[PDB]
Symmetry: D2
Subunit: 451 residues, 4 copies
């Protein structure tokens, strides 16, 4: 019933960040009892400003403030620089609101490293149990991401093929046209690996690589996802160079306006990625030998996040009439900005005989964006928010998840920190550095785009 | 290398060329050794025919005429071009005399190639008797029997679709598919065919040849390589494997319908008996539930329906796929319709697949979903290609080689054994046909045929 | 480190009061529960049979297995320290813990790597996938009995005096309801004073889809994989072979068995009573042969839910004379389904 | 041929049929020349070709094991199995018909039909219903799915040998193989991608003809620890003169903290001969006489099988006479020429031998 930010009068919060809070319930969903406690340097009535500062210790005892009943729960995000979190953690203690089920919502980066994340979580845990913790991951709230569960197990056509023999490899790519998210100097703090790959891509891979549960339970869903992250192939300095590629936002023509370089955008020489590509494997016994080719970067030629499952070829082209070449089957799922799923099959080409059979590849296409046009375009936060209020919530992260996510992340970065692996530049609007072609082409693979 | 032609005057041969010719007079595909041979009961010359031919279309035309009782206008073909295949479309009475002349001319040979479009049978006795007179004169290597469905391009892609894709083969077995459905629908009543249909019946007209050929295409095992002989041998196996329909199963597995007088195209249409002017028990519609017993196909029902005066004209092959082993969306709110693959072969050429998808919205109570169809349209993709007219590649097959499209004896021998066994069985039970209203999809008892075991009927409704 | 004995609980309230009072002092990592069954070599190889091999998995689902049979039969009684049966019956001792563990090691999915929680989590998922027999399902899906007087023996009551309403015999038709197993009845059976002692699992596979030879003499007997854990340690498979004979009337076939007896080769293995390894686990590492708090929860929930149904149906066991191979009524819980209790016959 | 007696005695007639057990061919033309001459008087129904090995009882059981059970076929696919190995070895000198043995080889005698039909009963699909030509019809497609060993593949896909000697017993310049090794390939959906290892010979120190089917490896090894290695699981079959069939499984070897976790490769063993010892113990030729009269027999080879046998037999012979290959003497009991071991040992495969008598320390 309350959310805390110390910078609202200042910087981004003052101009664009706040409406996310006001807009989502102002005409959308329904809310009536809430007590937004804000502090900085319907429910319109609830919002109320306050002032707080970590530097004076005696100040924390003085604020002594709690809006709403103790039997409600204390959710808050401390968006401060490192070492200021510890000073202001106790403020809810002056309120004292830890006893009731507490939402403890954390839509946050959660730190650069597992020790960095654990430091946070160990301190948060003493006031609140895991059941109280409700960490949001913005993709898990996207509807297009949610249907990955109906897709495999609400249909009998897929699961026979999710097993190494069925799939030769899978390709995932999160595409963004612009690097101007207002994160410059904040991106430097993390970067595309921790910014995008550590949870949102990993959460998607978990939806793709897992086993089905027996039923749609909250904790049955999450307990099977940690298994993929614990079954990831750990990328070591001995494997990072072959399996990883970093690239950086350069100066090209992007979006119609010509644009400039990352380093020249920060003003100082910068080393973060703004693009990365990995060749992962799941060793659960259903995925051994199946490469997942993951990719994300900014200043790319299109913003379009899609998954492409390429299946193993037929054991035999019985149409080896000199026209018998069969293009592997692809299951293509597009989740942003258009909602789309398609399959690629072979069909005899209308015609006679040129001393063989000639055929074409073609796509059975279905688009959710068009099929459901009279339906809603609800924001992820609107679906996610009710679950916070609801006694058991399903779309929120768990410690085993993040802890298994970071281990793979920290093992990779040291691998190229121990290998001294600098990024490679790309022209904004090019699809990235030229080294990501060999990374797949050394395996025979091609990255799916338009024709 | 060489082809001779018969029955030039009749509205059958000329009709197919009209639409094709206007689009194409250009192709000139045939090899030089072949030339236009025209024979009909006509007095137009060689020149004088190339004048009638031009309306259908002079460089390759040779004419000359014959008589149907005189084996003497038979030398006129002999006094015609012949360097160091034939098409006969006649009624039953002239069949052996027409064969008689070819032997006297010498135009009957191991070199000679035979093509036989007209109905070739009613029993084994016929099948064997009609073929055996041809067979003593000719071998299988010279006889190539036409099947008017087998040539449709949508049917040719059934081999590419099934065997050019690996997404179909893991589930193309008894465990993968709950049931297989084939439907051919005709809005039109027979027009001008009465007295020909009554002797054949609906089952002889469509089920014996085209529908059975389609059943094999879904059920046939793949050949090691695609050659007419390798592909055909597997198809014959499907006909041999088909479970025999006998008196015990005939009443349960077969429904027969005769079209009544109701309405077609917004106007009342008369009953089949009324058009004949004679009482008939012949069938204008048939429905069957059929099983092919094989390690791959044992226990999977295949249901075949073809009808006359049915509500719409379309031919569709729908293969339902087994329901998911567990509904992980239990506790209510989730219904998981099994996956279905629907392919349309008439009148639109189209393939679709059935998938389950969450409905846009929150989980709320239960998981809510819709089934939805991945749809592909074959006619639009090949827009720079031609249209639905046919009898095409079959020609190239003549000068170049053996034809996958043409029929062989063991199949026709296997078709009638299954088809003849059904007719005697409903003769021993005295199965009178059931009437239906023209445009209702057939007699309503054919609905129990599917509905008593849990099956329904696909409509885009 | 604290290790607990076999009599942990008699119901939900018990094992949750006894544990959450101890889990108030200790934790799940430092807590070990004792299953006498788990630590046996023949049980240990079940996971080694399934997942160290590739021959079985292609069929280990509702599309390759017809039925499983798990039997543990005894000749003795409970002499020396009777009281637990009076307190718990024959349900809570051997089924709630011992045989349910044998149920888990056959109907579970593989972990990525052999580690305690990763292996245990797959078993917990089974005990959650157990279809709960409740209400008016326990009469037609369960059979109870009591060993009578016969063979000098006297009955249980005809040796104890007081009237009790608890069975020394239970028959269930269990059901794991997951993608892998939906549709596969699991047949669990145990009891005392029966004419044999051999604990064994039997997995009957479905019949081949079509029979080429089934016209005359075509009796196609299904293939069954046989495993014997107690007291014989024996794994076999039933296969169909041609009868060498000059036959003029159809195909002649015999059901024969690929036989394997592991003790005969496992002599070098220092065969010993099961408990000797269990101590080292507690002494030097993570407990893989021990039950977990979530394992106890899903066991008792499915163990107690039946008790709801038969005390409301006021269900009483059915007398079998000792040596009646059980009550004759456990023969119809399968004969109504066509299946019959297997025997080497 | 001297069949000329029968037709010029009025004997080639419908009352009576024929079964042939003669050295019919050395090439496709000779059997067809024999066949065309016999089919010049008869048709295939009254023309029967006899293969001794088909007629052995334990050989008869190959398809019933394949098709009376549901455990194998799920794996009888390229995905299911890695490779097949067929071995037929003899103890005798090549002297039983030493002059006759020269000019036919061990290929056209033993492999062209006997072991190729052992190939046929392995790489076939099930027919509709058992019928005399239904069995044959699925073997023809096998004999058609046999990759024709190329003159470019005959160096890396074949190995020949000689009794060490055959020259020292026959006189004339001899290039005759007292041993043969090939690696065949069935190119159908079910089988494309599976090495078929065929091996036979006469100057070897053992006599037990056997088939071995190795199934593919597991995707993931959950039990990753020291000591525990996994040999792939295999099917072993021995029919003559021993009838002994086993399966390779991985079973735990009990130990406490000794050399890590322990797993043994042990065998489910079954011998038909002990079970049926009270039974016939007949001669492979016994029933074949009853099938011919008033009947359609399943157990006879057909001209297209022998034709497709010969076509695949001749395609090698041109090619290895084109590579000018000569046999390699092996000194009287070395399990073959030293080169047939690399035909697998380079491919990772090793020639399978009984674990007892194959191990040391």
């Amino acid at each position: 019933s309350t959310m805390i930010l110390f910078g609202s009068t200042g910087d981004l919060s003052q101009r664009m960040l706040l409406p996310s809070l006001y807009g989502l319930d102002a005409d959308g969903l329904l809310a009536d009892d809430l007590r937004i406690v804000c502090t900085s340097r319907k429910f319109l009535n609830k919002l109320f400003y306050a002032t707080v500062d970590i530097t004076d210790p005696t100040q924390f005892g003085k604020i002594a403030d709690l809006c709403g009943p103790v039997e409600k729960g204390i959710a808050i995000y401390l968006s401060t620089s490192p070492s200021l979190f510890e000073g202001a953690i106790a403020g809810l203690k002056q309120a004292g609101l830890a006893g009731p089920t507490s939402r403890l919502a954390l839509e946050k980066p959660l730190g650069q490293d597992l020790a960095s994340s654990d430091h946070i979580n160990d301190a948060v845990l003493k006031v609140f149990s895991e059941k109280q913790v409700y960490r949001i991951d913005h993709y898990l709230g996207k509807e297009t991401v949610q249907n990955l569960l109906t897709l495999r197990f609400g249909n009998a056509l897929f699961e026979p093929l999710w097993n190494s023999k069925g799939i030769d490899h899978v390709q995932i790519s999160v595409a963004e046209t612009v690097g101007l998210e207002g994160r410059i100097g904040y991106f430097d703090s993390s970067g595309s690996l921790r910014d995008m790959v550590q949870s949102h891509i990993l959460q998607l891979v978990a939806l793709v690589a897992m086993e089905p549960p027996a039923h749609m339970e909250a904790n049955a869903v999450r307990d099977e996802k940690v298994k993929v992250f614990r079954a990831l192939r750990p990328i070591n300095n001995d494997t990072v160079i072959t399996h990883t590629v970093t690239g950086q936002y350069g100066a090209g023509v992007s979006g119609g306006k010509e644009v400039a370089g990352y380093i020249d955008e920060l003003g100082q020489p910068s080393d973060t990625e703004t693009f990365v590509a990995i060749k992962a494997h799941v060793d659960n016994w259903r995925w051994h030998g199946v490469p997942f080719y993951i990719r994300t970067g900014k200043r790319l030629p299109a913003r379009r996040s899609e998954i492409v499952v390429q299946f193993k070829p037929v054991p035999h082209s019985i149409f080896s009439s000199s026209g018998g070449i069969l293009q592997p089957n692809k299951l293509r799922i597009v989740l942003q900005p258009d909602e789309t799923i398609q399959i690629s099959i072979m069909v005899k080409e209308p015609g006679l005989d040129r001393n063989g059979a000639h055929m074409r590849e073609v796509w059975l296409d279905l688009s959710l964006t068009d099929v459901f046009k009279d339906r809603k375009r609800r924001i992820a936060y609107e679906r996610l928010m009710l679950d916070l209020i609801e006694g058991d919530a399903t779309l929120f992260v768990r410690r085993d998840e993040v802890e298994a996510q970071w281990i793979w992340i920290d093992g990779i970065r040291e691998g190229w920190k121990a290998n001294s692996m600098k990024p490679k530049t790309y022209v904004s609007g090019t699809w990235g550095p030229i080294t990501a072609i060999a990374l797949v082409e050394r395996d025979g693979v091609t990255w799916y785009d338009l024709e």
